Amino acid sequence: SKGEELFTGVVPILVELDGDVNGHKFSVSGEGEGDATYGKLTLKFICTTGKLPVPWPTLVTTFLQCFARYPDHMKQHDFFKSAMPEGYVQERTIFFKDDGNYKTRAEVKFEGDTLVNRIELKGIDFKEDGNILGHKLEYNYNSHNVYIMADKQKNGIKVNFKIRHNIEDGSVQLADHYQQNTPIGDGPVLLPDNHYLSTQSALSKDPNEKRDHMVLLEFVTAAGITHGMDELYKAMAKETAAAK
Amino acid sequence: SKGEELFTGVVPILVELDGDVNGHKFSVSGEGEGDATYGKLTLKFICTTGKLPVPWPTLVTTFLQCFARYPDHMKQHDFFKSAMPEGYVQERTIFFKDDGNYKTRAEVKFEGDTLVNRIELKGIDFKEDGNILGHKLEYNYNSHNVYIMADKQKNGIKVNFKIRHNIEDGSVQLADHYQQNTPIGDGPVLLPDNHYLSTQSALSKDPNEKRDHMVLLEFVTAAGITHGMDELYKAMAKETAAAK
Amino acid sequence: SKGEELFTGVVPILVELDGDVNGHKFSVSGEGEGDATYGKLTLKFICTTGKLPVPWPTLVTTFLQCFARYPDHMKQHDFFKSAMPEGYVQERTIFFKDDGNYKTRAEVKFEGDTLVNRIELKGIDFKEDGNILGHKLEYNYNSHNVYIMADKQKNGIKVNFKIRHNIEDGSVQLADHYQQNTPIGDGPVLLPDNHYLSTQSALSKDPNEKRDHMVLLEFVTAAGITHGMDELYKAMAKETAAAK
Amino acid sequence: SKGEELFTGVVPILVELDGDVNGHKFSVSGEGEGDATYGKLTLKFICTTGKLPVPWPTLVTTFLQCFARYPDHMKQHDFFKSAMPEGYVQERTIFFKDDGNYKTRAEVKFEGDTLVNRIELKGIDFKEDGNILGHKLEYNYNSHNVYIMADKQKNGIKVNFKIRHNIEDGSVQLADHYQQNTPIGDGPVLLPDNHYLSTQSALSKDPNEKRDHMVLLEFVTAAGITHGMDELYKAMAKETAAAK
Amino acid sequence: SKGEELFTGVVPILVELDGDVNGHKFSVSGEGEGDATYGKLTLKFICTTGKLPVPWPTLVTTFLQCFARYPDHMKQHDFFKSAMPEGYVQERTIFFKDDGNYKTRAEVKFEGDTLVNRIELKGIDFKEDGNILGHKLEYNYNSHNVYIMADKQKNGIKVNFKIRHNIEDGSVQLADHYQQNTPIGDGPVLLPDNHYLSTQSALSKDPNEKRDHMVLLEFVTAAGITHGMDELYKAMAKETAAAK
C-alpha cells in the first residue's frame, strides 16, 4: 500500500496518555523513534503528574504496531501501515487475572512528520492488596505473540493476546488483552488473513533522569503466513547433487 | 521555563501586517490556532486592502516560532516560549536573489488568551520584470531548516536560513533570511545552544472565500541537540541477548 | 456592517453610573479606552460620592460588549457594533443568590469620538449581614461565558450568564444575569445565531489614587460558531504526505 | 564463546544493499534464514530500484559468514560468531580480472532476533563491452575456498579468495577478493589460526516473482585444522584384531 | 543407482540426538566421516547436556547404514544409497530383554556435502536396579548380523537383529531391534532381496576430551547373495591341469 512508504526511514514518535486507575489521575508523555524496516522502537516515557500510581510494565502494551516488520512475502497483511497517514483507532480491554481491568482508547496517526499515539485509559476494580496497586511486578518484560484476524464488518482487525508479568515472588500475573483497530480515514485498507506478531521488549532507566520514567526498546516481527518456497529450496538442494 | 506552560493547549492566534513593497501599500489579517504540543499551526490570511501586490509564498515566513515542538531533552533551548507572555521582537531582512529585499519588524506576545503577531514590512528594489512583482512563484512551499544561535550581547537569538521558492519554469528563487529576536520583557530568558527547526508547510485556498487569501498549515520541530542515549539503547539491545 | 468600521482603532470610553442600593445613593465615573481589534478594554472607575456602598466586583458587568473581538468567520453575529453609532439600550436584572438584586438600564452610543455608557442602577432586598453589604467579596474576577441569542421580536438580543464571586472564606457567591439589548436607531441591525463571549478580567488599584476606585483590564472574544474548515485542514495534512 | 550460542537455532536474516556501479544506482533487499548448526543459508533478494544493472552472481559474496558450520574440534577458530551480538564490520575490494572493481563496507549484527547485513557498494572502471556490464555471466555459482588468518593488529581477521564466474562462451571470469573483518563491540573476540571455509551455492528463480530477484541456497563448512585423532583411530583398527 | 555415486569418497557426517529415557532428558552431537568404498565409519559423540544417563553402548545402533560396503555383485541390493540425496526415515523399537525399550525415529539425508543423521529417542519402562540404568554394561561392542528384507508395501525395507551387550559379571544383555526404513523422496528406490550386513565396532575414549563422550570405529560389509562363480573357478582349477 501507499501508507507503507511512510515507514521506510526513521520516524519520530510522540505518545500522550491520560489515565485514571481507581480514581488516581495520571499522565504520561513519551518520545522516541521507530524504524519499521527493522521492526524497531526506542521510547522514553515520563510521568508528568508525579509518581506513576501503577507499575510501568502494566502500561507497556498501551503506550504503535505500525512499527512492526512485515516480511516481504506478507506485506499485504499489514493493516497498520495501510491505514496511514489518516491512522487508526485502537481500543482495548485488559483483564488482569484476579484483579482489575484497564479500558483504553487510542488514536494513532501522523501529525506532520511525527507518528502520534494519543491514549485515554480507565482502570477499575483493582485490589489495594493486589499485585498492581501493591507494585509487586518485576521491572522487566516477556516476549509475546499477538494474534491478528480481519474484522471485515468493521473494516479493521481484531487482536488477542495474554501478557505475562513476572511477580516478585516468582509467580506470573496474566493480563488478557482484547483489542480492535479501525481506520480513521474513509479510504480502503488492507485486511489481513490470520497471522501474529512476535514481540520482545527491554525496560531500563535513564541514570540522568530524576522524574518517574521508563525507557523501552522493542522489536516486533510479523509471522504466521508461509512463503511457500520449501519445495523450491528442496529442488535446489537436490540440484546441488544432480550434477555433482 | 514559566512561559512554556502557556503553550500546553490550543492557543488562538491573531496576525496583523502592514506593508509597502515598491510603494504598493497593503495589509493582511490572519487568524488561526496553534498547538505547540504537536508543533502545529493552522492559519487563514486575508488581504484587507484588495489584491495582494506580491505572491503569497513571499510572506509565509513573515506571517510564530513559539509554536514549534521542542523535544523533552531540548526544552531548555526554547527561547521563544521563555520570552512569553511579555513576548519578543522579531526582526528580519530577506534578500531575494537577483531581486529586491523585505525588511520586517514584528512583536509577538499575548494579548489576553490570544497570541498576537503584529508586523511592519518594507520591500524595496524589486524588478518589475522579476519573479516577485511578475507573480511567477508557484503556490506551494518547501521544507526548510532554520538555524538558531544565542546572541548573548542582545539577550536573544540570531537566526539564519535560505528559503526555496519554486518558479513556474522549474527554476528555484532563493531568499536569504537574516533574523534576530529580542525579549520585550526585562525578565530572564532561556538562551540556547546551536540548534535548528525543521519546517514543513502546506498552502491552500478556502473554496468559499471570495477575498484574496491564503490558508496555511505548518509543522515545526526543533532538532540538533542529541539526547545522548545511544549507548543506553545499545546496552539494552545487548541485554536482549545477555540472558537469552 | 457599517458600525464595525467605527471600532478599527483605539476608541475613548466614558462611563457614568447613578445608583441606589438599599437606599444608599452613589455615583461612579469611568474613563478608558477600547481596542476591539484585540477585544481589549482598559478602564479606571472613581466613586464620585465618596465610599462605594457595595463591593467593586458587583459592578464590573454593569460598568461595553461592542469592544469584543468577533473572529472573521463570525463578523455577521456582532449585534453590538452593528447598532452603532446610534447605539443600544442594555437592560439587566442581576439576582445575587440568597441576597438582593440589581436592576439596570444603560444606553451605549457614540457622542462624537467617544463611546459612552450611561447607566441607572437600583438594588433592593440586600441583607445587612450578607456578602454584598458585608463587603465579603474578594477583589478579583473570574472568567465567564456570556450566552447570546437573537430576539427577533424586539429587533435585538437576549443574553444570559452566571458570574462567580469569590468570597473571603472560600465560598462562591453567584449572580444570575438576565440581559436584553435593543437598538436605539431605526436602521437595520445584525441579528446573530446562538454564540457566546469568553471573558477575562483583572482588577487592580492605582497606587497614586486617593479616591475609592477600581482599575479594570478586560479581554473578550466571541466563540461558538464553527469556521467549518476542519475537513480542509485534514486534506492539506494528507497532501503533506500524498506527494512525500 | 557466548556469541556462538545465538546460532543454535534458525535465525532470521535481513540484507540491505545500496550500490553504485559506474554511476548506475541500485538497491537490493534480501530476506531469509540461517541454520549454522548445518552451515546452511536460504535467502531471496529483490532489486527494489528496478532492473539490477550488474549480473546477480557478481553480488553473491557481498550479500553472512557467521552462518558457517565450524566442526567441534575447531570451534575456537570462529571469529564471526564470537563478535556477536555487537557484530562486525566486513570490508572488501573485489578486483574483476581485466575489468572493474567493487569496494564494499558492511555491518553484520543482531537487531533483536534478526541477523542484519547492511552494505554500501561502489563499483568503478567497468568496461561497457566487458563481461559484467555486458551481462555475459552464466546464472550459476562455483564452490570455493575462503582463506582466513588472524589480524591481531586490528583485533580481527584478514580473508582472501578468488571466485570463478562462468561466462557464456565457456571462459571463466575471475574476481580476486581482499577482505577484512573487525569487531563492532569492545569485548574480546576469538582470533583464529589459519583455516578455510568450503562454500557451495545454488542460484535459482522464484517462478511466482515478477521483480528482478535471486534465490540463493548456500552451505559453508570450516576446515583446515586437524582433529589429530588419526593415531587413535589407527590404534582401535589394530585392537579390532589384537584380540581377534 | 545415482545415489551410490555420492559415496565414492570420504563424506563428512553430522549426528544429532535428543532423548528422554525414563524422564532423563539428554542430547548427543556426533561428528566424523564415512568411506563407503571400504564400509568404514569414524565418529566422535559428545553428550551436550552433561553426563549421559544411559550406557554409551546402548546408543551405538541409534547413532548410518548408507556407509556399508556392498560387493560389486550385490550393488543392486543397496536401498540405503539409492534413497540419497533425499534420504530415508529410519524407525526402530529396541526391546532390552527383562528391561525397558527405546523407540527411535531418524532422518538420514544430505545437507550440502554433509550426511546428516537427526534422531528423536524415547526410552520407557527401564528398571532402576537393572543393567541399563545401573550402568553395568562393559564399554565394548560385539559383531553382529543385520538382516534386511524388502518391504514393497512401504517402498522400503524391514530390518531385524539382536545385539549382545557384555555385562560386568560375564552375562550378556540382549536387545531385540525391529527396524524399518522408508524413502523421504518420491523417486524410485532399489528394493533388495534378502541379505545381511556384517558389522564390527570398536569403542574408545579421546584422552584429551573432558566431556562425556564416545569414539566409534565401525566397519560394515553386505553379504548373503552369492556371486555364483564357484563353477567358473572350478573350471579354471581344472584347466590349471587339463594342459599341464
PDB file of C-alpha atoms in Angstrom, chain A residues 35-179:
ATOM      1  CA  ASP A  35      12.421   2.141  12.206  1.00  0.00           C
ATOM      2  CA  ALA A  36       9.805  -0.313  10.803  1.00  0.00           C
ATOM      3  CA  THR A  37      12.374  -1.561   8.256  1.00  0.00           C
ATOM      4  CA  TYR A  38      13.906  -3.391  11.297  1.00  0.00           C
ATOM      5  CA  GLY A  39      10.670  -3.626  13.358  1.00  0.00           C
ATOM      6  CA  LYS A  40      12.437  -1.428  15.940  1.00  0.00           C
ATOM      7  CA  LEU A  41      11.130   1.059  18.636  1.00  0.00           C
ATOM      8  CA  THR A  42      13.102   3.234  21.065  1.00  0.00           C
ATOM      9  CA  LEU A  43      10.977   5.295  23.523  1.00  0.00           C
ATOM     10  CA  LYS A  44      11.306   7.215  26.801  1.00  0.00           C
ATOM     11  CA  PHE A  45       8.187   7.842  28.904  1.00  0.00           C
ATOM     12  CA  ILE A  46       7.835  10.452  31.684  1.00  0.00           C
ATOM     13  CA  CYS A  47       5.011  10.606  34.247  1.00  0.00           C
ATOM     14  CA  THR A  48       4.146  14.325  34.084  1.00  0.00           C
ATOM     15  CA  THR A  49       1.874  14.273  37.176  1.00  0.00           C
ATOM     16  CA  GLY A  50       4.471  12.940  39.637  1.00  0.00           C
ATOM     17  CA  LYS A  51       4.737   9.311  40.727  1.00  0.00           C
ATOM     18  CA  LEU A  52       3.040   6.774  38.482  1.00  0.00           C
ATOM     19  CA  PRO A  53       0.261   5.105  40.619  1.00  0.00           C
ATOM     20  CA  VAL A  54       0.624   1.753  38.789  1.00  0.00           C
ATOM     21  CA  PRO A  55       3.671  -0.369  37.735  1.00  0.00           C
ATOM     22  CA  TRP A  56       5.303   0.808  34.465  1.00  0.00           C
ATOM     23  CA  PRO A  57       5.096  -2.762  32.961  1.00  0.00           C
ATOM     24  CA  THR A  58       1.250  -2.596  33.132  1.00  0.00           C
ATOM     25  CA  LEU A  59       1.351   0.305  30.623  1.00  0.00           C
ATOM     26  CA  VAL A  60       3.799  -1.126  28.014  1.00  0.00           C
ATOM     27  CA  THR A  61       1.152  -2.542  25.653  1.00  0.00           C
ATOM     28  CA  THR A  62      -0.949   0.682  25.931  1.00  0.00           C
ATOM     29  CA  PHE A  63       1.995   3.025  25.192  1.00  0.00           C
ATOM     30  CA  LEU A  64       2.419   1.627  17.845  1.00  0.00           C
ATOM     31  CA  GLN A  65       2.105  -1.689  15.956  1.00  0.00           C
ATOM     32  CA  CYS A  66       2.623   0.180  12.652  1.00  0.00           C
ATOM     33  CA  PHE A  67       6.361  -0.116  13.518  1.00  0.00           C
ATOM     34  CA  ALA A  68       6.287  -3.900  13.158  1.00  0.00           C
ATOM     35  CA  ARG A  69       8.482  -5.502  10.464  1.00  0.00           C
ATOM     36  CA  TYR A  70       6.271  -7.455   7.925  1.00  0.00           C
ATOM     37  CA  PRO A  71       8.395  -9.867   5.795  1.00  0.00           C
ATOM     38  CA  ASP A  72       8.259  -9.246   2.029  1.00  0.00           C
ATOM     39  CA  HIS A  73       6.046 -12.264   1.374  1.00  0.00           C
ATOM     40  CA  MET A  74       3.497 -10.949   3.937  1.00  0.00           C
ATOM     41  CA  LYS A  75       3.380  -7.156   3.153  1.00  0.00           C
ATOM     42  CA  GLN A  76      -0.278  -7.387   2.098  1.00  0.00           C
ATOM     43  CA  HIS A  77      -1.216  -8.360   5.742  1.00  0.00           C
ATOM     44  CA  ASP A  78      -0.058  -5.044   7.247  1.00  0.00           C
ATOM     45  CA  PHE A  79      -3.296  -3.293   8.196  1.00  0.00           C
ATOM     46  CA  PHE A  80      -1.460  -0.866  10.491  1.00  0.00           C
ATOM     47  CA  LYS A  81       0.571   0.911   7.805  1.00  0.00           C
ATOM     48  CA  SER A  82      -2.213   0.661   5.180  1.00  0.00           C
ATOM     49  CA  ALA A  83      -4.395   2.926   7.439  1.00  0.00           C
ATOM     50  CA  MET A  84      -1.733   5.680   7.372  1.00  0.00           C
ATOM     51  CA  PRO A  85      -1.467   8.664   7.338  1.00  0.00           C
ATOM     52  CA  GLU A  86      -5.182   9.100   8.388  1.00  0.00           C
ATOM     53  CA  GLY A  87      -4.446   6.497  11.087  1.00  0.00           C
ATOM     54  CA  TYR A  88      -6.467   4.143  13.213  1.00  0.00           C
ATOM     55  CA  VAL A  89      -8.381   3.868  16.446  1.00  0.00           C
ATOM     56  CA  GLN A  90      -7.006   1.180  18.780  1.00  0.00           C
ATOM     57  CA  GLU A  91      -9.349   0.033  21.548  1.00  0.00           C
ATOM     58  CA  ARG A  92      -8.583  -2.463  24.333  1.00  0.00           C
ATOM     59  CA  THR A  93      -9.909  -4.045  27.451  1.00  0.00           C
ATOM     60  CA  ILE A  94      -7.128  -5.576  29.531  1.00  0.00           C
ATOM     61  CA  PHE A  95      -8.285  -8.030  32.211  1.00  0.00           C
ATOM     62  CA  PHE A  96      -5.685  -8.612  34.941  1.00  0.00           C
ATOM     63  CA  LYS A  97      -6.375 -12.099  36.325  1.00  0.00           C
ATOM     64  CA  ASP A  98      -7.861 -11.941  39.850  1.00  0.00           C
ATOM     65  CA  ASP A  99      -7.608  -8.152  39.743  1.00  0.00           C
ATOM     66  CA  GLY A 100      -8.952  -5.103  37.900  1.00  0.00           C
ATOM     67  CA  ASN A 101      -9.100  -4.088  34.264  1.00  0.00           C
ATOM     68  CA  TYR A 102      -7.925  -1.275  32.005  1.00  0.00           C
ATOM     69  CA  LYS A 103     -10.139   0.067  29.188  1.00  0.00           C
ATOM     70  CA  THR A 104      -8.220   2.144  26.610  1.00  0.00           C
ATOM     71  CA  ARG A 105      -8.976   4.149  23.504  1.00  0.00           C
ATOM     72  CA  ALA A 106      -6.156   5.478  21.319  1.00  0.00           C
ATOM     73  CA  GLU A 107      -5.739   7.289  18.033  1.00  0.00           C
ATOM     74  CA  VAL A 108      -2.539   6.541  16.114  1.00  0.00           C
ATOM     75  CA  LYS A 109      -1.807   8.862  13.145  1.00  0.00           C
ATOM     76  CA  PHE A 110       0.664  11.275  11.558  1.00  0.00           C
ATOM     77  CA  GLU A 111       0.781  14.920  12.632  1.00  0.00           C
ATOM     78  CA  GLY A 112       3.280  16.285  10.103  1.00  0.00           C
ATOM     79  CA  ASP A 113       6.389  14.025  10.180  1.00  0.00           C
ATOM     80  CA  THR A 114       5.546  12.705  13.638  1.00  0.00           C
ATOM     81  CA  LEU A 115       3.693   9.478  14.361  1.00  0.00           C
ATOM     82  CA  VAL A 116       1.398  10.337  17.322  1.00  0.00           C
ATOM     83  CA  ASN A 117      -0.275   7.903  19.780  1.00  0.00           C
ATOM     84  CA  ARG A 118      -2.897   9.724  21.953  1.00  0.00           C
ATOM     85  CA  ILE A 119      -4.490   7.485  24.635  1.00  0.00           C
ATOM     86  CA  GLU A 120      -7.403   7.669  27.193  1.00  0.00           C
ATOM     87  CA  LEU A 121      -7.159   4.934  29.945  1.00  0.00           C
ATOM     88  CA  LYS A 122      -9.592   3.981  32.692  1.00  0.00           C
ATOM     89  CA  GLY A 123      -8.755   1.306  35.283  1.00  0.00           C
ATOM     90  CA  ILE A 124     -11.286  -0.065  37.758  1.00  0.00           C
ATOM     91  CA  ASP A 125     -11.795  -2.842  40.312  1.00  0.00           C
ATOM     92  CA  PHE A 126      -8.145  -3.054  41.290  1.00  0.00           C
ATOM     93  CA  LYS A 127      -7.443  -4.636  44.733  1.00  0.00           C
ATOM     94  CA  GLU A 128      -5.437  -2.444  47.195  1.00  0.00           C
ATOM     95  CA  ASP A 129      -3.631  -5.564  48.448  1.00  0.00           C
ATOM     96  CA  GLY A 130      -3.124  -6.934  44.851  1.00  0.00           C
ATOM     97  CA  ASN A 131      -0.071  -7.050  42.546  1.00  0.00           C
ATOM     98  CA  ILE A 132      -0.896  -3.897  40.598  1.00  0.00           C
ATOM     99  CA  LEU A 133      -1.687  -1.373  43.304  1.00  0.00           C
ATOM    100  CA  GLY A 134       0.801  -3.288  45.525  1.00  0.00           C
ATOM    101  CA  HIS A 135       3.609  -2.629  42.991  1.00  0.00           C
ATOM    102  CA  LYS A 136       4.730  -6.304  43.052  1.00  0.00           C
ATOM    103  CA  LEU A 137       5.601  -6.514  39.350  1.00  0.00           C
ATOM    104  CA  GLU A 138       9.272  -7.007  38.396  1.00  0.00           C
ATOM    105  CA  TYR A 139      10.630  -4.190  36.127  1.00  0.00           C
ATOM    106  CA  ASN A 140      11.110  -6.451  33.125  1.00  0.00           C
ATOM    107  CA  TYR A 141       9.144  -7.691  30.123  1.00  0.00           C
ATOM    108  CA  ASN A 142       8.408 -11.002  28.427  1.00  0.00           C
ATOM    109  CA  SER A 143       8.204 -11.953  24.718  1.00  0.00           C
ATOM    110  CA  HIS A 144       4.717 -12.484  23.373  1.00  0.00           C
ATOM    111  CA  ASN A 145       2.620 -13.439  20.412  1.00  0.00           C
ATOM    112  CA  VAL A 146      -0.037 -11.011  19.249  1.00  0.00           C
ATOM    113  CA  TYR A 147      -2.762 -12.787  17.226  1.00  0.00           C
ATOM    114  CA  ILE A 148      -4.423 -10.837  14.416  1.00  0.00           C
ATOM    115  CA  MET A 149      -7.534 -11.565  12.354  1.00  0.00           C
ATOM    116  CA  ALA A 150      -9.528  -9.445   9.917  1.00  0.00           C
ATOM    117  CA  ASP A 151     -12.756  -7.845  11.128  1.00  0.00           C
ATOM    118  CA  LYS A 152     -14.493  -7.259   7.801  1.00  0.00           C
ATOM    119  CA  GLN A 153     -17.680  -5.984   9.476  1.00  0.00           C
ATOM    120  CA  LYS A 154     -15.744  -3.042  10.960  1.00  0.00           C
ATOM    121  CA  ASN A 155     -13.222  -2.657   8.134  1.00  0.00           C
ATOM    122  CA  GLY A 156     -10.473  -3.400  10.627  1.00  0.00           C
ATOM    123  CA  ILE A 157      -8.830  -6.086  12.738  1.00  0.00           C
ATOM    124  CA  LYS A 158      -9.493  -7.992  15.981  1.00  0.00           C
ATOM    125  CA  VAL A 159      -6.364  -8.690  18.082  1.00  0.00           C
ATOM    126  CA  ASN A 160      -5.973 -11.022  21.089  1.00  0.00           C
ATOM    127  CA  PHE A 161      -3.108 -11.959  23.375  1.00  0.00           C
ATOM    128  CA  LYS A 162      -2.126 -12.828  27.012  1.00  0.00           C
ATOM    129  CA  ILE A 163       0.877 -10.924  28.546  1.00  0.00           C
ATOM    130  CA  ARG A 164       2.940 -12.500  31.351  1.00  0.00           C
ATOM    131  CA  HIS A 165       4.039 -10.183  34.172  1.00  0.00           C
ATOM    132  CA  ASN A 166       6.719 -11.554  36.467  1.00  0.00           C
ATOM    133  CA  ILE A 167       5.915 -11.025  40.157  1.00  0.00           C
ATOM    134  CA  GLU A 168       8.485 -10.549  42.970  1.00  0.00           C
ATOM    135  CA  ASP A 169       7.817 -13.991  44.492  1.00  0.00           C
ATOM    136  CA  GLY A 170       8.273 -15.870  41.203  1.00  0.00           C
ATOM    137  CA  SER A 171       4.586 -16.149  40.278  1.00  0.00           C
ATOM    138  CA  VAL A 172       3.241 -14.825  36.971  1.00  0.00           C
ATOM    139  CA  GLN A 173       0.432 -12.218  36.689  1.00  0.00           C
ATOM    140  CA  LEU A 174      -1.596 -12.628  33.492  1.00  0.00           C
ATOM    141  CA  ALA A 175      -3.313  -9.872  31.542  1.00  0.00           C
ATOM    142  CA  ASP A 176      -5.817 -10.869  28.850  1.00  0.00           C
ATOM    143  CA  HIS A 177      -5.880  -8.279  26.050  1.00  0.00           C
ATOM    144  CA  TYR A 178      -8.949  -7.847  23.818  1.00  0.00           C
ATOM    145  CA  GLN A 179      -8.163  -5.368  21.069  1.00  0.00           C
TER     146      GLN A 179
END
